[PDB]
């Protein structure tokens, strides 16, 4: 599953637009040699667009059905991920001096280690602009399935057809068939 790093690029997906705005020493290969982080962020933005297309067409396949939807509930977001991965790199990447961005980019490592769990890096509140929503679904053929938090592009009513992909053993992708 190489798409696991695809969601994390799609998790940020708009911070790379901010670094283009923030660090841009525009007035030739000299201008290419003066700023490098804009080029890296542009490559990552293009990769984010490609992973968005892959996540868009990744649910359309020949997989012969998952389940009818059983009892489920909403999840909502964790704002600590948005304070960790989005505000602090934004403050790191605008200070100049070459010596403060290293400190703030180590602070984001410290917050990512000690304040949030390893598996809960997919619950980014930035991943709400692209029509995404999580529902915790108890899937019950397929078999018994519990504690599987599903990424969905629409609402999830009960007792209806749904196609599935798989992302991890905690998370997966679902699309509603009518």
Ligand X SMILES: CCCCCCCCCCC(CCCCCCCCCC)(CO[C@@H]1O[C@H](CO)[C@@H](O[C@H]2O[C@H](CO)[C@@H](O)[C@H](O)[C@H]2O)[C@H](O)[C@H]1O)CO[C@@H]1O[C@H](CO)[C@@H](O[C@H]2O[C@H](CO)[C@@H](O)[C@H](O)[C@H]2O)[C@H](O)[C@H]1O
> Under the criterion CB under 6 A, does residue 80 sit at the interface with ligand X?
yes
| Distance of alpha carbon 174 from alpha carbon 66, whole angstroms | 9
Residues 49-88, mask of contacts with a second copy (x by CB under 8 A): ---------------------------xxxxxxxxx-xxx
Considering only CA atoms, which of 162, 3, 146, 136 is closest in space to residue 75? 136
> Under the criterion CB under 6 A, does residue 87 sit at the interface with ligand X?
yes
> Under the criterion CB under 6 A, does residue 75 sit at the interface with ligand X?
no
> Under the criterion CB under 8 A, does residue 136 sit at the interface with a second copy?
no
Considering only CA atoms, which of 35, 4, 10, 30 is closest in space to residue 20? 35
If 0-12 CB within 10 Å is exposed, 13-18 middle and 19+ buried, where does residue 85 land?
buried
Between CA 143 and CA 57, with CA 70 as vertex, the angle to 5 degrees is 80
| Distance of alpha carbon 17 from alpha carbon 157, whole angstroms | 35
Query: Residue 73: which residues within 8 A CB-CB, separation 6 or more?
Result: 135, 136
Closest separation in Å from C-beta 113 to a second copy: 6
Q: Which of 14, 20, 72, 83 binds ligand X (CB under 6 A)?
A: 83
- H/E segment holding residue 152: strand 148-152
> Under the criterion CB under 8 A, does residue 100 sit at the interface with a second copy?
yes
Residues 2-41, mask of contacts with a second copy (x by CB under 8 A): ------------x--xx--xx-x-----------------
Which residues of the shown chain bind a second copy in the complex (CB under 8 A)?
14, 17-18, 21-22, 24, 76-84, 86-95, 99-100, 102-104, 106-107, 110, 113-115, 117-120, 125-126, 128-129
Residues found near ligand X in the complex (CB under 6 A): 78-80, 82-83, 86-87, 90, 111
């Amino acid at each position: 599953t190489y798409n696991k790093v695809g969601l994390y690029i799609l998790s940020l997906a708009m911070l790379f637009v901010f670094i283009i705005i923030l660090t841009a020493k525009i007035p030739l290969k000299k201008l290419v040699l003066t700023n490098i982080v804009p080029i890296v962020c542009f490559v990552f933005f293009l990769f984010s667009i490609y992973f968005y297309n892959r996540l868009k067409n990744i649910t359309k396949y020949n997989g012969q059905d998952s389940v009818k939807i059983t009892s489920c509930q909403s999840e909502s977001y964790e704002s600590l991920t948005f304070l960790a991965t989005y505000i602090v790199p934004f403050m790191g990447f605008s200070f100049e001096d070459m010596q403060k961005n290293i400190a703030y980019l180590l602070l984001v490592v410290v917050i990512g280690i000690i304040f949030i769990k390893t598996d809960k890096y997919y619950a980014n509140p930035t991943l709400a602009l692209f029509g995404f929503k999580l529902y915790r679904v108890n899937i019950l053929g397929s078999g018994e399935t519990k504690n599987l938090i599903a990424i969905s592009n629409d609402v999830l009513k009960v007792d209806d057809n749904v196609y599935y992909s798989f992302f991890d053993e905690f998370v997966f992708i679902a699309r509603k068939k009518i």
